[model samples]
Target: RMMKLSLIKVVNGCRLGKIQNLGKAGDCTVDIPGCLLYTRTGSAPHLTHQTLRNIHGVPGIAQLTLSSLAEHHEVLAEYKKGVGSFIGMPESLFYCSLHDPVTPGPAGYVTSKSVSVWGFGGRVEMTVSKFMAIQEALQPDWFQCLSDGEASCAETTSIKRARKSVDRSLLFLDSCLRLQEESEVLQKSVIIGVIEGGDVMEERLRSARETAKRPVGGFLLDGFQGDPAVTETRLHLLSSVTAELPEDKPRLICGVSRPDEVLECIERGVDLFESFFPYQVTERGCALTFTFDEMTSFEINLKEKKYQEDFDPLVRGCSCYCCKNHTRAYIHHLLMTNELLAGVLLMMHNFEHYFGFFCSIREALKNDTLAQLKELICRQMF
Candidate 1:
């Protein structure tokens, strides 16, 4: 279904807002009933693990990273085969639009007739025909048509090249649906046209308006910087771009990491966000402590000595499995002891914390308490 991102309320100064029917960030969810089922080279997140028995699975939006595919070709195949239902496999997989060196990552995975492979893409130093081939191979529930996205977000590239990127991107998008019909590929996949223009307002307007003319499922806001001031800086840009786009379809802004940034993007009419921050923090043995419920401190490193004898839960009142059953002392011990369990415990807690924050966000947005929910979370706050 097209995301009719119903904007029910808005908080002006704090930059927070509400949306309905804006569910699941693409490939996976940190939110409850959702977790990353990481792939092992070429497979679904532990498809055969005993834990899978008790849960239905889904791939919250994922990158068709080249290495991930090169390593797990058979994994994608197995997932495609098991798409009959979660009784044997994860619920679904998604492909983030990015640069593909050779081709799209998985072959039949994105195109599975059994399950819809939502969201697939690419931007840049690549050809439209090749991009078409990639989508055909990745198989998506719906994928973005090739857009000149590579340059819009490029802060280091030459300004000339950045401008070229927009022209190139929209050209590809204009050619997107055409390729689907003419090439006779991408049948099982829906094609989403990307809106690109980098920092140029005129270019942004042109790209958004033209791309929206296509019979596509959604629009993408690709050039916005992920900086905190990004909300203020790109507010006009996103406003202009989205204004040209149809209000009924989904509009996504990816590569955003900070909590404040997420809240601001929501108010700006952006519907989804990438669920990657938890992994980045856990990979470093840190646990997320920020509360989306008006809370600060992004996380704490469990390897620190201060927690040597601390018996408190990661967050005192937290209800996550890791927090309720284990203590900061235990997790710190696991890390200091160099036990693999350290990462597991931390990852589990971080996942719970991040998802819990989103749950609170949904509730806050619905109740129109988003302003109060925008508090700075910190270690001392609980």
Candidate 2:
């Protein structure tokens, strides 16, 4: 019951891909090289994976996983202690991240599904048996295997360390694939293989080819983050790695959200993106204005006193709930007063803008106007 994927075309290196008959939970079709697919935990401090209605570009709903609502239970619990009962998780979210926000956990199964539910910084590892159970529980349209993403840009950067993470990722892949057979529920979902290997080109190619050997629906590029589009060489590295894999399968890039970088990665052969950018932006009290338009401002810091007098919406013509009923001055006042509603308003606006941009990307690929789309996004400095 694996999902069926088809590559309709490749406009300039951007992929125009489609997924249909995505097995039982819901028969859905989204045709694009980049599907708006990444879902964070249900208690992401600011927003969860739950659908938002009454927004212009929001996906009213998405099929969630049998996986627990919170990836890191301690995170939500601790945050709730500080923020009070308003942002709390359900009783079942016992599992949380070891390295907050997808930090490469020490080495192996750092976070355990044990009685304590919180363990040491030891290597985070999951047996294929546990992996299957989580997948069956979550029922995600696509799920990634536990990866060795130990490389962190914070106070640490090493070639050897990064390479080790990649190796460990492959080791887990074997354990991951071995259990695919026994679970009937998992057979219905798209199992994506993780691609690791730090910045080393040879290791990247090695990871790519080895992961491609499995029956994965696509590849998830996990190691590199925070602007691989920082350099043309970095993007070229991605191109080289994807070249070894089947052109038919999609390449989903994690942790990338800026418009210019996403387009660059698409040109470099990436097909998926993370939605965390909007979350990041919302926390910063900023409103996204980088649409396909050329004359608009990129983003505004709603917290700035300057916006206190500005009565306009976050973005013109944006029908998001925030813009439809609120104004910059109103949101600015909320931020100044430490109101949670400031975040809610910005999240609605930012997610709408970000998701709509990707839709425009899929349309651009179909029209062979990706160059134009790229040009428009690049119009702003970003």
Candidate 3:
């Protein structure tokens, strides 16, 4: 009996001190404020299979994206073998062809291939019917509609092109939904509509309005590429788009980083987030130095020379495994030496901090202290 899901509030406001459980499939009840659900995936072949096993055994996580569409059946089969269920899949089904030359620009490597074609990104192609057949075979619980368009600075023409991407995405959605209704296996999965409009306010609103009208399980506001400077504008756009959405439906914005930005977006009403930011930090040989302390101001780069011999946790009063067992001196040493363990430790800490940050946000929202929460987040820095 699959049905439309609902978020039942036993407690409401900026902080959720207590929440009652209303069991529903894919619906999670969080007692910890700002706590959002997450799914983990392995980063490389050597690590993925076992990683999937570990994540599946974890209590709260029940959904995941098994692989990129390029790998198609192979990846899905491997993931199903590891997890017993391929619960989630990427929203975009198309992939950039390896044959395509990468472009060199401010945003490095803008591939010439279609952003969301039925099959390959480059010249290679597959019909929409064939694409739908592959998706039905996978039977993922959630899948994203394809969209093309980059979110970086663009002129009016580029913005219009981005808007047109959304229109094409809607057509794809309609086709997928109709195809899904006809298939018993595919009917179980939910199609999440992607809202794309570069950074144009009017176009964003239009994209949101049209996408919302479809039978989407949720919304993914694409484009807001990872630039902190665009925070205010992004927030304004999110607020406008959210106002038009049905309140209970989940809204996910991809590629969010920085603690303050996370709090700001939550205030504007986003429910889900990708856990890729921590991995990005881990790759940079840096530890996230943002603290939850009331008076803190910017992110601190632990890779700085000063921390070479400093003996302290990445963040004070933090309960992450890395913070609890290791000191800054040890992490600094590992990072300086180019040890893989450094990335692992920092990743664990960042993930914990991120999860905790979301919990705090939900608490603030449940308690109706969102304003104070924003202030607290803004005060912190590295």
Candidate 4:
């Protein structure tokens, strides 16, 4: 039920922390500037368990979402087993969140008593009681408290909306905390608090202060995404928001996985990120081609006509199964013919490249070369 983040060092406000006591048995640990395995319901979107093993540097923590699993709560509750066992991935750590980071939800669905998650099937309205019931059934190692995250993009948000969101989220966290303490199934699980205030700097500070007063295992920095110009403001705003938080708990920001944006957030002290970027690229029939330096473009669209006869691998010097076995022409053919294999192959390469990027980030932090890596990524921004 406890998680501890011990700082190894800090370079340019980027933390190099190690998380310990993260599982139900309090035995797992993950490093900072880390990414989680993004999943649809309980499984990876395109890759199967067997195929997932073929990838290099797979993330240990799997991020599950209520948006995909909420409508099936009855079956899981009756099964009397946690989602990890039900999904046949008991070896992997699980973190259950309220909604899908890649899929944006419709606004104005939240009310005084309940919040809503748009599942694949449709809208699944959730009161605090219903939310905790699913959490108990899912039994994740770490789960976020229910929050009113309406102001996800900063530019469209008003100060009034930001304050309301922070107030509602704080109230929901208190309710969820009470239920989490009472549930025997969640006794050994950790609950993370969400910090929400849109782009309002004052409200952001208040949100962080109020959420930190709770006994949360970690912090989720929400409502931070927008256009590049708006993102610049939010990026600088993160320093003040994080300063209000205790240094012991990890800080995770969702929906900002672009390599350049990721580097900027890391420079502002965000410790964890989600793997939604690679999944988005895979869905678009694209492959990541970026390296540690600034020579290559970020990605290539295999669906483009230029790849019709190009026989090279998706990325040269790549050892993923997709690259080693498939060619650009074959992938392009699969996309043109609407074959499902294109997604599988693209997902394989994208995950490999994205995970490898994180490995490079950690390495750069340890070697005191993050500025050079950041310069390389930002200079090649598309």
Candidate 5:
């Protein structure tokens, strides 16, 4: 039930690991320092199957959150075709996680018996049995074990609370593994252990150390939320946590997606990230205009009145569908009139821009020019 990861190279602390086999069939590949294709429920937000397929460079791993799917588990179980087939994305590898990184749950709801995940219908409390039942129904290639990740970014987190969080996460992982070993439907699925210790360095290291002892396929560093700025200050904690784990398994991270934050995490040995930043930017009616080669404004707000008469594309030389044929003024018009196409077009451009950014990161790491790439983005960072 383990996935194989081959380290291509490591420049400074950055990794160029690549998974030779990712899916249940062991036929797919995913490169490290890469990002997951973010999805809500079984679909990509603001884009349909036809639209998402046409976008170039989308990652193979599609992240599905229980927060979106828990309410529909009964219906999905009856379908029996699994989420990938049911959603018409059978070719894409499914990665099921406990919560949506973009939508953090309310703090302080975690208990010894269960944790709560907020779905569209409201909060759905999940015990280990219920969580594993949903996993069996979804039949994802990879899934994170249930974890207690309810800790604040403030220094007010007590060491006792942090230790309890780790203890509960490890206990939940063990319980899930026991159920996983007995379920025929989950034999081919890999479990990714989640490390949660909030801001306490000692508990963070303890979580990583203990989690690595389990037979998990990978590791997900949890606990930080809200803004990347706060996460930036705690990256040293990331460095220490990664140091405690073995080198073979992939290390995934959540709650950090800005280009600068992604770069910073990579420097500290994080491998996978979610593409939530693009989706968030699209929600606000903005377009990504950042360039890796030269300094430029990070993004442009199309809803602003200044774009009313602008005839330029979202970015000067971007080849995305939105930038190729649509103008800033046209997108601005759509936003002003409350057109749904506005989101469709903007989602395309943002995903394209973000995909290209990851490609550049992988390229730079391979060529040992990561510092050069880092400097280019940092200089233009807000």
Candidate 6:
């Protein structure tokens, strides 16, 4: 009965909405009853098991990455745990590929090529059998299908090539699903169909329609990076895709950052996001200065000379541990002194803010105050 998944509404009040079990292992069923489930994209091999334990306690996170199916098994064996049990208790485990290579190494499994096809050529040579074998061996609750192209800010020819790549990916899904039906072990994993359009409206609609006809448990809208100048065009594309998708199935977009962009996407119905943007900002030695309470056009530069002796919390009223325990002057000193803890602290704040942002959004939806909520967040804070 694992396949009989459904969404149930538990509360009907403003700022509170809840759904029943979302069928992935490790998915939050009790603690974060109303939150959308999400997983971190990548974890360095050097990170210890203890670091992962700390990550598990973060409020809204429900999934962890094992790099590959093989590494997943090896790590499980050493700890006498199943891959799913690595994160929490007897729930499910979510797995992903860095798309490196498909070799069986001592570290577990590796992909022959990185699956990030953005600037790479548009030819996907992976076969259906290859996909199913990995699914059976790894048993990930959710898995991304192999697509050959990345979102590009390119020309019509490039967009056409991206469309063709999506078509071929559909073929891979069809074949992979057939293999899943034939192999009992592969039947438990849910196949999330990826939508690719490379910034073309008609082509995006085509991809959405064709992909929706298949037996997919969810949909991933990929390739939204073409023409950075056309921000409205990208929004239009996203809105179109959202309109086409079935509301019951979750829709995830891989590479959106910025608080405004995140708010806009939520309005357009993106259910999950990759939590890498905060890490990116942390690497730049910067802190998020945008306020989500009311829409503001304010952007703060953490490296500016203004913070030399100024002692203030990173964001007023933020409930994150970093803001509660530290000051901007201290974090600034850490940045100046080249301390690794600066990134960790900033990342912690950003993660808290982003996850809380999702909660605010679902509340708006339940209360039918999404427009007012959008206006409040889109305007300048001051």
lDDT of each: 0.54, 0.62, 0.54, 0.86, 0.87, 0.55
Q: Which of the two candidates, 1 or 3, achieves a greater TM-score against the reference? A: 3
lDDT score, candidate 4? 0.86
lDDT per residue as tens, model 5, 63-118: 88989999888998898778988988777688888888778677767898998899
lDDT of 1 by residue, 70-132 (tens): 223345445543221223324454443452322223322211011111223222223566555
Q: Is candidate 2 or candidate 4 better by TM-score?
A: 4
Error of 2 at 369 (Å): 2.7
Q: State the lDDT of candidate 2 residue by residue for 245-318, as single tens digits.
A: 78877677765666777888888888766555666677677888876731124577887899999999988898
lDDT of 6 by residue, 1-382 (tens): 2333244432221112222354554343322112323334223222333443333234332333323333334344465434455544444445343233211112211132323211122323234565455456556666766653343434444665656666766776687778878976555667778887666677778888888898787777775532222277677778888788776566666555455565566656665655544555555666666655411233344566688676888888887777888988888888888887777777766666666666666656666666776677667532
**Residue 175 lDDT in candidate 2:** 67
Task: Indicate the residue-level lDDT of 133 in model 2.
Answer: 53
Query: How well does candidate 2 score on lDDT at residue 347?
Result: 81
Cα TM-score per model: 0.72, 0.78, 0.73, 0.95, 0.96, 0.73
For residue 115, what is the lDDT in candidate 6?
Answer: 34
Error of 4 at 344 (Å): 0.8
Report the C-alpha lDDT of model 4 over 1-382, residue by residue, as the tens digit: 2877789899889899789878887778888889988886768888889899899988868888988889999999998689989978776688888889888678788876898998878999999999999998899988888998776544576888889989999999999999988888998888889999887888889999999999998999887765442267788788889888888888988777878888888888898888988898888788998877411257888888999999999988899998899899999999999999899999999999999999999999999999999888876665
Model 1 alpha-carbon drift over 4 Å, by segment: 1-67, 70-90, 99-126, 152-163, 182-185, 227-231, 294-296, 377-382
Query: Least accurate stretch of 10 residues (summed lDDT) in model 6?
Result: 101-110
Off by over 4 Å in 6: 1-19, 24-127, 151-154, 157-163, 183-185, 226-230, 294-301
Score residue 258 of candidate 6 by CA lDDT: 50
lDDT of 3 by residue, 1-382 (tens): 1323345342322113322221223343334223222333222212333342332112132233322343365565455422224433232121111111111113322232233222232322334555566565555555565444454445444665666666766776687778888977665566777787777777778888898888886777666644443367777877787777766556656656456666666556666555455545666666666645311244456677888888989888887767888988888888788787876677667666666666666656656666776776666543
Give the Å shift of residue 260 in candidate 5: 1.1
> Which candidate model has the greater TM-score, 1 or 6?
6
